[PDB]
């Protein structure tokens, strides 16, 4: 309903005509703009006392198909420091051929133990529909995951884990207006998980597909935009403040998300409640920050809350940046992916993450990672 800012027009009106101007001038502008006005600033990268502890390693998980590691990523040296728990499945066929496996990495909503029924994972399997682990493994990809609540609660009435506590305490009684919220913390945790993958000799951290569904897809996008080590970015039905254009004011709006989830974004993002016309950015520019690395955005046909048309139109509005790198986006009809390095599909049915979503993502990763 409101015109989108041009990703190729700088803050001073200069037109960006090449990928070198983009990477060196326009990219840092937009990152700062999304930091200040939407997600909050990421206040640290790698902490100096980060410690990796492999707590379990099972060489014959899932009937022999995968090696399974559970890893404590602790962010201080004191063994009582805050930490997150990474679960990693590696396909044993890939290990057997002395290859480092490409990886699908994403946060989960209900706990590492919910991604598969595997009773050794430290409500089991109750989220299996969104996590076809054996099929990903059979296709030759490792699967790495961390529970989002290790880093920050999902609901505003959630319990704090040690990492959320540490950040909560650091925020005193109130956050600064440009301080990060849950999506920024979630994105940061994905980059710390990638830090671990760099050290694990079973996996190729240069071939990591960072994915997320819904709120954790907001986080995957923000992680991929800030951290260009990620090889490929997948946003499944991330909706408002993820891939959907805020200025379309369709489905969930800025005021609605900030009201129900006041810890997800920066306080500054609340200044755009029922004022999306004033946003100096929109989500097509977040998609653009992933270029030239491959980016997959997908919708569900009945998921009006997420604004599927707004998600597709953000992909289209980001395409000119991808075209600076000679990549192509979508030219769509249901169940027909479209686009080259910048890809979109919309499937029938409700909000969710299905076998067909993953079939499309696996084929995408095959093209770019295998
Ligand atoms: O997670 C998932 C979704 O959960 C809620 O529906 C929320 O309103 C959305 O913004 C979010 O993307
Ligand atoms: Na590695
Ligand atoms: Na919306």
Author numbering: 33 to 154, 176 to 384, 389 to 427
Paper quotes:
To further probe the role of R268, the R268A variant was constructed in silico in the SHED catalytic assembly as the QM region, which can in our simulations interact electrostatically with the MM area. However, in the deacylation step of the R268A variant, the proton transfer was not accompanied by nucleophilic attack. The OtCE15A-R268A variant was constructed experimentally and kinetic parameters determined with both BnzGlcA and MeGlcA. With both substrates the kcat is reduced >80-fold compared to the WT enzyme, and there is also reduction in Km as observed previously with the H408A variant, which would be consistent with accumulation of the CI. Indeed, crystallographic determination of the OtCE15A-R268A structure after soaking with the BnzGlcA substrate clearly shows the formation of a CI, mainly arising from the significantly damaged interactions in TI2. The CI in the crystal structure of OtCE15A-R268A was compared with the one generated from our simulation and the one of OtCE15A-H408A variant, showing little differences. Furthermore, our theoretical results indicated that the conserved active-site arginine, whose side chain is proposed to contribute to forming the oxyanion hole, plays a prominent role in both acylation and deacylation steps, especially in the latter.
The bacterial GE OtCE15A possesses a classical yet distinctive catalytic machinery, with easily identifiable catalytic Ser/His completed by two acidic residues (Glu and Asp) rather than one as in the classical triad, and an Arg side chain participating in the oxyanion hole. As a classical ABH, the reaction catalyzed by OtCE15A was assumed to proceed through a covalent intermediate preceded by an acylation and followed by a deacylation step, both going through a tetrahedral transition state. The formation of the CI (acylation step) and breakdown of the CI to release the final product (deacylation) both go through formation of a tetrahedral transition state with a charge on the oxygen stabilized by the so-called oxyanion hole.
